[PDB]
Amino acid sequence: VLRVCSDPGNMPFSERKGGGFENKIAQIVADELKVKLRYYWLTQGFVRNTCDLIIGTATNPYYRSAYVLVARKGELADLKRLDDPRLKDRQIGIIAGTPPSNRLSELKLVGERIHAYAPKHQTVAAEVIADLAEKKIDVAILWGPAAGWLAKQSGVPMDVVPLLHEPPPLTFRVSMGVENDWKRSLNTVLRKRKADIEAVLREYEVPLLAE
């Protein structure tokens, strides 16, 4: 029986009801291996505290995403880069310690207008999106696979722009985590059910990058 290390409250990634896209992906992997699926639930030292499989974190990567810029639709048209001069007077929200914070300090985007959230709402990224919907901030810098679905649930239209022009890097490949023969069997599953896994990522508005 496939045992997956997952979070019972971490939408859009996973939830105990099985509604996250990593639950759908773990269900695809279990069906491919002709086996049942069970979870060891724990809240996100998650790894060594936790089962046999981690869906998102190594095996061959099955998608590549980036940190994104999120803003209310129509307020910062064509916003693509962190050095855009329109951000100098904007309230910016970001999770403290995340990779983009080095570029913010590099561009002197520091101080009062920078809302650093510590890593009411299910996740900290959900709160940042909610603060953006309630105009408590004007710009949100979050991990793509989380912000895409969360923006769809916010209630106000938003623009999700992947950060591709920032010189640490802000783009990351995502693989499964684990026994290199077991990693070999999982790489086989990712290679076969690629079209099904990629369709699940698109349904949850996960920004997908090439290469």
PDB file of C-alpha atoms in Angstrom:
ATOM      1  CA  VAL A   1       0.000   0.000   0.000  1.00  0.00           C
ATOM      2  CA  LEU A   2       1.363   3.400  -1.037  1.00  0.00           C
ATOM      3  CA  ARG A   3       2.004   5.524   2.070  1.00  0.00           C
ATOM      4  CA  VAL A   4       2.337   9.251   1.345  1.00  0.00           C
ATOM      5  CA  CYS A   5       3.750  11.846   3.743  1.00  0.00           C
ATOM      6  CA  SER A   6       1.274  14.717   3.488  1.00  0.00           C
ATOM      7  CA  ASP A   7      -0.199  17.747   5.306  1.00  0.00           C
ATOM      8  CA  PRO A   8      -3.866  17.552   6.399  1.00  0.00           C
ATOM      9  CA  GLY A   9      -4.291  21.318   5.983  1.00  0.00           C
ATOM     10  CA  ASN A  10      -2.156  22.762   3.194  1.00  0.00           C
ATOM     11  CA  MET A  11      -4.344  23.768   0.264  1.00  0.00           C
ATOM     12  CA  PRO A  12      -3.883  23.900  -2.649  1.00  0.00           C
ATOM     13  CA  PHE A  13      -1.210  21.240  -2.107  1.00  0.00           C
ATOM     14  CA  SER A  14      -3.047  18.779   0.124  1.00  0.00           C
ATOM     15  CA  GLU A  15      -5.781  18.329   2.707  1.00  0.00           C
ATOM     16  CA  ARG A  16      -7.180  15.390   4.638  1.00  0.00           C
ATOM     17  CA  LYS A  17     -10.326  15.485   2.483  1.00  0.00           C
ATOM     18  CA  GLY A  18      -8.091  14.753  -0.517  1.00  0.00           C
ATOM     19  CA  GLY A  19      -8.915  17.906  -2.470  1.00  0.00           C
ATOM     20  CA  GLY A  20      -5.402  19.184  -3.101  1.00  0.00           C
ATOM     21  CA  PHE A  21      -3.574  18.604  -6.357  1.00  0.00           C
ATOM     22  CA  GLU A  22      -0.909  16.572  -4.548  1.00  0.00           C
ATOM     23  CA  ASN A  23      -3.695  14.295  -3.300  1.00  0.00           C
ATOM     24  CA  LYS A  24      -4.811  13.813  -6.909  1.00  0.00           C
ATOM     25  CA  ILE A  25      -1.204  13.180  -7.951  1.00  0.00           C
ATOM     26  CA  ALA A  26      -0.695  10.697  -5.108  1.00  0.00           C
ATOM     27  CA  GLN A  27      -3.929   9.007  -6.201  1.00  0.00           C
ATOM     28  CA  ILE A  28      -2.590   8.821  -9.766  1.00  0.00           C
ATOM     29  CA  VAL A  29       0.649   7.233  -8.535  1.00  0.00           C
ATOM     30  CA  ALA A  30      -1.237   4.711  -6.390  1.00  0.00           C
ATOM     31  CA  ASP A  31      -3.505   3.711  -9.282  1.00  0.00           C
ATOM     32  CA  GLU A  32      -0.528   3.363 -11.633  1.00  0.00           C
ATOM     33  CA  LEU A  33       1.260   1.020  -9.213  1.00  0.00           C
ATOM     34  CA  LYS A  34      -2.001  -0.971  -8.833  1.00  0.00           C
ATOM     35  CA  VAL A  35      -2.017  -0.365  -5.089  1.00  0.00           C
ATOM     36  CA  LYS A  36      -4.041   1.299  -2.347  1.00  0.00           C
ATOM     37  CA  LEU A  37      -3.284   4.789  -1.039  1.00  0.00           C
ATOM     38  CA  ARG A  38      -2.938   5.740   2.628  1.00  0.00           C
ATOM     39  CA  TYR A  39      -1.539   8.844   4.310  1.00  0.00           C
ATOM     40  CA  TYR A  40       0.534   9.675   7.369  1.00  0.00           C
ATOM     41  CA  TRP A  41      -0.793  13.133   8.204  1.00  0.00           C
ATOM     42  CA  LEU A  42       1.483  15.742   9.776  1.00  0.00           C
ATOM     43  CA  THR A  43       1.634  19.528   9.587  1.00  0.00           C
ATOM     44  CA  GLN A  44       4.447  20.988   7.473  1.00  0.00           C
ATOM     45  CA  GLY A  45      11.178  19.508  10.479  1.00  0.00           C
ATOM     46  CA  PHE A  46       8.473  17.766   8.473  1.00  0.00           C
ATOM     47  CA  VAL A  47      10.677  15.457   6.390  1.00  0.00           C
ATOM     48  CA  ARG A  48      12.628  13.542   9.032  1.00  0.00           C
ATOM     49  CA  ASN A  49       9.557  13.665  11.287  1.00  0.00           C
ATOM     50  CA  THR A  50       7.791  11.740   8.504  1.00  0.00           C
ATOM     51  CA  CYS A  51       5.486   6.899   5.318  1.00  0.00           C
ATOM     52  CA  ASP A  52       7.412   6.352   2.077  1.00  0.00           C
ATOM     53  CA  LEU A  53       6.652   9.175  -0.373  1.00  0.00           C
ATOM     54  CA  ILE A  54       6.623  12.971  -0.518  1.00  0.00           C
ATOM     55  CA  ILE A  55       4.790  14.310  -3.562  1.00  0.00           C
ATOM     56  CA  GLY A  56       6.361  17.767  -3.758  1.00  0.00           C
ATOM     57  CA  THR A  57       9.930  18.754  -2.896  1.00  0.00           C
ATOM     58  CA  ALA A  58      14.679  13.489  -5.081  1.00  0.00           C
ATOM     59  CA  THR A  59      13.303  11.804  -8.198  1.00  0.00           C
ATOM     60  CA  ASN A  60      13.178  13.267 -11.689  1.00  0.00           C
ATOM     61  CA  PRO A  61      11.337  16.614 -11.605  1.00  0.00           C
ATOM     62  CA  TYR A  62       7.792  16.480 -12.952  1.00  0.00           C
ATOM     63  CA  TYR A  63       7.271  20.251 -13.224  1.00  0.00           C
ATOM     64  CA  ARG A  64       9.149  23.534 -12.878  1.00  0.00           C
ATOM     65  CA  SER A  65       7.604  26.619 -11.287  1.00  0.00           C
ATOM     66  CA  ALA A  66       8.681  29.983  -9.878  1.00  0.00           C
ATOM     67  CA  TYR A  67       7.871  32.607  -7.293  1.00  0.00           C
ATOM     68  CA  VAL A  68       5.153  34.873  -8.640  1.00  0.00           C
ATOM     69  CA  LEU A  69       4.010  38.469  -8.406  1.00  0.00           C
ATOM     70  CA  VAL A  70       0.329  38.747  -7.473  1.00  0.00           C
ATOM     71  CA  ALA A  71      -1.625  41.990  -7.780  1.00  0.00           C
ATOM     72  CA  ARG A  72      -5.240  43.049  -8.124  1.00  0.00           C
ATOM     73  CA  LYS A  73      -6.334  42.901 -11.758  1.00  0.00           C
ATOM     74  CA  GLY A  74      -5.759  46.196 -13.552  1.00  0.00           C
ATOM     75  CA  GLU A  75      -3.616  48.013 -10.980  1.00  0.00           C
ATOM     76  CA  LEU A  76      -0.067  47.205 -12.190  1.00  0.00           C
ATOM     77  CA  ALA A  77      -0.450  46.276 -15.855  1.00  0.00           C
ATOM     78  CA  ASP A  78       2.462  44.406 -17.471  1.00  0.00           C
ATOM     79  CA  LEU A  79       4.293  44.104 -14.134  1.00  0.00           C
ATOM     80  CA  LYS A  80       7.037  41.545 -14.752  1.00  0.00           C
ATOM     81  CA  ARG A  81      10.166  42.469 -12.789  1.00  0.00           C
ATOM     82  CA  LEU A  82      10.998  43.324  -9.189  1.00  0.00           C
ATOM     83  CA  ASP A  83      12.957  46.421 -10.281  1.00  0.00           C
ATOM     84  CA  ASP A  84       9.815  47.990 -11.778  1.00  0.00           C
ATOM     85  CA  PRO A  85       9.708  51.614 -10.542  1.00  0.00           C
ATOM     86  CA  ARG A  86       5.993  51.358  -9.697  1.00  0.00           C
ATOM     87  CA  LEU A  87       6.810  49.144  -6.684  1.00  0.00           C
ATOM     88  CA  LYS A  88       8.686  51.857  -4.756  1.00  0.00           C
ATOM     89  CA  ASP A  89       5.482  53.127  -3.092  1.00  0.00           C
ATOM     90  CA  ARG A  90       3.507  49.859  -2.948  1.00  0.00           C
ATOM     91  CA  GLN A  91       2.690  47.798   0.122  1.00  0.00           C
ATOM     92  CA  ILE A  92       4.451  44.498  -0.617  1.00  0.00           C
ATOM     93  CA  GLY A  93       3.698  41.214   1.150  1.00  0.00           C
ATOM     94  CA  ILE A  94       6.164  38.331   1.309  1.00  0.00           C
ATOM     95  CA  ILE A  95       6.845  35.325   3.528  1.00  0.00           C
ATOM     96  CA  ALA A  96       9.918  36.036   5.648  1.00  0.00           C
ATOM     97  CA  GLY A  97      13.024  34.122   4.598  1.00  0.00           C
ATOM     98  CA  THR A  98      11.761  33.105   1.153  1.00  0.00           C
ATOM     99  CA  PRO A  99      14.258  33.352  -1.749  1.00  0.00           C
ATOM    100  CA  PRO A 100      12.822  36.581  -3.255  1.00  0.00           C
ATOM    101  CA  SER A 101      13.597  38.505  -0.044  1.00  0.00           C
ATOM    102  CA  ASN A 102      17.252  38.815  -1.086  1.00  0.00           C
ATOM    103  CA  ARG A 103      16.298  40.647  -4.285  1.00  0.00           C
ATOM    104  CA  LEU A 104      13.998  42.938  -2.284  1.00  0.00           C
ATOM    105  CA  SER A 105      16.885  43.947  -0.019  1.00  0.00           C
ATOM    106  CA  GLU A 106      19.100  44.206  -3.108  1.00  0.00           C
ATOM    107  CA  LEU A 107      16.690  46.700  -4.714  1.00  0.00           C
ATOM    108  CA  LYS A 108      16.313  48.685  -1.448  1.00  0.00           C
ATOM    109  CA  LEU A 109      12.669  47.554  -1.217  1.00  0.00           C
ATOM    110  CA  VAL A 110      12.971  47.458   2.570  1.00  0.00           C
ATOM    111  CA  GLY A 111      11.287  48.989   5.578  1.00  0.00           C
ATOM    112  CA  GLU A 112       7.737  50.093   6.271  1.00  0.00           C
ATOM    113  CA  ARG A 113       6.078  49.046   3.004  1.00  0.00           C
ATOM    114  CA  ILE A 114       7.445  45.473   3.201  1.00  0.00           C
ATOM    115  CA  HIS A 115       5.071  43.129   5.052  1.00  0.00           C
ATOM    116  CA  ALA A 116       7.149  40.121   6.118  1.00  0.00           C
ATOM    117  CA  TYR A 117       4.867  37.242   7.113  1.00  0.00           C
ATOM    118  CA  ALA A 118       6.171  34.655   9.557  1.00  0.00           C
ATOM    119  CA  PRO A 119       6.283  31.138   7.971  1.00  0.00           C
ATOM    120  CA  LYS A 120      -7.527  32.517  10.956  1.00  0.00           C
ATOM    121  CA  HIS A 121      -6.249  31.139   7.647  1.00  0.00           C
ATOM    122  CA  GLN A 122      -5.162  27.617   6.766  1.00  0.00           C
ATOM    123  CA  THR A 123      -1.712  28.654   5.500  1.00  0.00           C
ATOM    124  CA  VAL A 124       0.385  31.806   5.625  1.00  0.00           C
ATOM    125  CA  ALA A 125       0.142  32.119   1.831  1.00  0.00           C
ATOM    126  CA  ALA A 126      -3.658  32.093   2.133  1.00  0.00           C
ATOM    127  CA  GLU A 127      -3.445  35.030   4.547  1.00  0.00           C
ATOM    128  CA  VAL A 128      -1.167  36.985   2.193  1.00  0.00           C
ATOM    129  CA  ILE A 129      -3.646  36.476  -0.655  1.00  0.00           C
ATOM    130  CA  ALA A 130      -6.498  37.497   1.655  1.00  0.00           C
ATOM    131  CA  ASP A 131      -4.591  40.628   2.680  1.00  0.00           C
ATOM    132  CA  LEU A 132      -4.161  41.401  -1.024  1.00  0.00           C
ATOM    133  CA  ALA A 133      -7.893  40.952  -1.644  1.00  0.00           C
ATOM    134  CA  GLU A 134      -8.696  43.266   1.290  1.00  0.00           C
ATOM    135  CA  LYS A 135      -6.173  45.889   0.056  1.00  0.00           C
ATOM    136  CA  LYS A 136      -4.080  45.489   3.211  1.00  0.00           C
ATOM    137  CA  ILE A 137      -1.222  45.003   0.727  1.00  0.00           C
ATOM    138  CA  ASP A 138      -0.892  45.898  -2.949  1.00  0.00           C
ATOM    139  CA  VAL A 139       1.598  43.225  -4.086  1.00  0.00           C
ATOM    140  CA  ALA A 140       2.110  39.608  -3.011  1.00  0.00           C
ATOM    141  CA  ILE A 141       5.299  37.619  -3.649  1.00  0.00           C
ATOM    142  CA  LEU A 142       4.534  33.933  -3.124  1.00  0.00           C
ATOM    143  CA  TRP A 143       5.453  30.476  -4.369  1.00  0.00           C
ATOM    144  CA  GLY A 144       3.692  29.840  -7.675  1.00  0.00           C
ATOM    145  CA  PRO A 145       2.046  26.452  -7.058  1.00  0.00           C
ATOM    146  CA  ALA A 146       0.373  27.955  -3.974  1.00  0.00           C
ATOM    147  CA  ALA A 147      -0.594  31.443  -5.163  1.00  0.00           C
ATOM    148  CA  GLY A 148      -2.222  30.365  -8.433  1.00  0.00           C
ATOM    149  CA  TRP A 149      -5.086  28.444  -6.846  1.00  0.00           C
ATOM    150  CA  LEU A 150      -5.301  30.750  -3.816  1.00  0.00           C
ATOM    151  CA  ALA A 151      -5.808  33.817  -6.016  1.00  0.00           C
ATOM    152  CA  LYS A 152      -8.728  32.034  -7.695  1.00  0.00           C
ATOM    153  CA  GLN A 153     -10.393  31.605  -4.279  1.00  0.00           C
ATOM    154  CA  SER A 154      -9.720  35.156  -3.053  1.00  0.00           C
ATOM    155  CA  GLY A 155     -12.943  36.668  -4.412  1.00  0.00           C
ATOM    156  CA  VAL A 156     -11.310  39.539  -6.320  1.00  0.00           C
ATOM    157  CA  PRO A 157      -9.624  39.175  -9.738  1.00  0.00           C
ATOM    158  CA  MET A 158      -5.839  38.988  -9.576  1.00  0.00           C
ATOM    159  CA  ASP A 159      -2.854  38.766 -11.915  1.00  0.00           C
ATOM    160  CA  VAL A 160      -0.320  35.991 -11.283  1.00  0.00           C
ATOM    161  CA  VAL A 161       2.988  36.784 -12.998  1.00  0.00           C
ATOM    162  CA  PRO A 162       5.935  34.367 -12.634  1.00  0.00           C
ATOM    163  CA  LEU A 163       9.235  36.064 -11.788  1.00  0.00           C
ATOM    164  CA  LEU A 164      11.540  35.034 -14.635  1.00  0.00           C
ATOM    165  CA  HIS A 165      13.931  38.008 -14.944  1.00  0.00           C
ATOM    166  CA  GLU A 166      15.435  38.119 -11.457  1.00  0.00           C
ATOM    167  CA  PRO A 167      19.215  37.373 -11.390  1.00  0.00           C
ATOM    168  CA  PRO A 168      19.592  32.951  -5.366  1.00  0.00           C
ATOM    169  CA  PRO A 169      17.359  31.920  -8.276  1.00  0.00           C
ATOM    170  CA  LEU A 170      13.588  32.215  -8.011  1.00  0.00           C
ATOM    171  CA  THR A 171      12.735  29.283 -10.319  1.00  0.00           C
ATOM    172  CA  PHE A 172      12.737  25.740  -8.937  1.00  0.00           C
ATOM    173  CA  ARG A 173      12.125  22.257 -10.299  1.00  0.00           C
ATOM    174  CA  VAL A 174       9.783  20.114  -8.201  1.00  0.00           C
ATOM    175  CA  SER A 175      10.269  16.359  -7.808  1.00  0.00           C
ATOM    176  CA  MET A 176       9.073  13.639  -5.461  1.00  0.00           C
ATOM    177  CA  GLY A 177      11.014  12.681  -2.361  1.00  0.00           C
ATOM    178  CA  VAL A 178      12.181   9.343  -0.971  1.00  0.00           C
ATOM    179  CA  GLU A 179      16.262   3.082  -2.281  1.00  0.00           C
ATOM    180  CA  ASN A 180      17.232   4.124  -5.806  1.00  0.00           C
ATOM    181  CA  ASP A 181      15.210   1.206  -7.180  1.00  0.00           C
ATOM    182  CA  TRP A 182      12.132   2.707  -5.517  1.00  0.00           C
ATOM    183  CA  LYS A 183      13.104   6.076  -7.002  1.00  0.00           C
ATOM    184  CA  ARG A 184      13.464   4.217 -10.306  1.00  0.00           C
ATOM    185  CA  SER A 185       9.897   2.896 -10.088  1.00  0.00           C
ATOM    186  CA  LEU A 186       8.616   6.402  -9.332  1.00  0.00           C
ATOM    187  CA  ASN A 187      10.534   7.929 -12.262  1.00  0.00           C
ATOM    188  CA  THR A 188       8.792   5.332 -14.405  1.00  0.00           C
ATOM    189  CA  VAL A 189       5.393   6.426 -13.083  1.00  0.00           C
ATOM    190  CA  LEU A 190       6.177  10.109 -13.676  1.00  0.00           C
ATOM    191  CA  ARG A 191       7.312   9.318 -17.224  1.00  0.00           C
ATOM    192  CA  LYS A 192       4.141   7.360 -18.032  1.00  0.00           C
ATOM    193  CA  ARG A 193       1.399   9.436 -16.361  1.00  0.00           C
ATOM    194  CA  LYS A 194       2.960  12.792 -17.300  1.00  0.00           C
ATOM    195  CA  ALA A 195      -0.092  13.987 -19.242  1.00  0.00           C
ATOM    196  CA  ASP A 196      -2.386  13.134 -16.321  1.00  0.00           C
ATOM    197  CA  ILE A 197      -0.182  14.769 -13.677  1.00  0.00           C
ATOM    198  CA  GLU A 198       0.311  17.894 -15.799  1.00  0.00           C
ATOM    199  CA  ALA A 199      -3.451  18.183 -16.335  1.00  0.00           C
ATOM    200  CA  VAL A 200      -3.969  18.184 -12.559  1.00  0.00           C
ATOM    201  CA  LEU A 201      -1.413  20.973 -12.122  1.00  0.00           C
ATOM    202  CA  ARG A 202      -3.169  23.093 -14.754  1.00  0.00           C
ATOM    203  CA  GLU A 203      -6.583  22.549 -13.151  1.00  0.00           C
ATOM    204  CA  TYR A 204      -5.194  24.037  -9.914  1.00  0.00           C
ATOM    205  CA  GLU A 205      -3.635  27.031 -11.745  1.00  0.00           C
ATOM    206  CA  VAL A 206      -0.058  25.894 -11.044  1.00  0.00           C
ATOM    207  CA  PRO A 207       2.384  28.008 -13.114  1.00  0.00           C
ATOM    208  CA  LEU A 208       4.289  25.563 -15.321  1.00  0.00           C
ATOM    209  CA  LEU A 209       7.637  26.456 -16.897  1.00  0.00           C
ATOM    210  CA  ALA A 210       9.636  24.799 -19.656  1.00  0.00           C
ATOM    211  CA  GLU A 211      13.067  23.161 -19.365  1.00  0.00           C
TER     212      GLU A 211
END
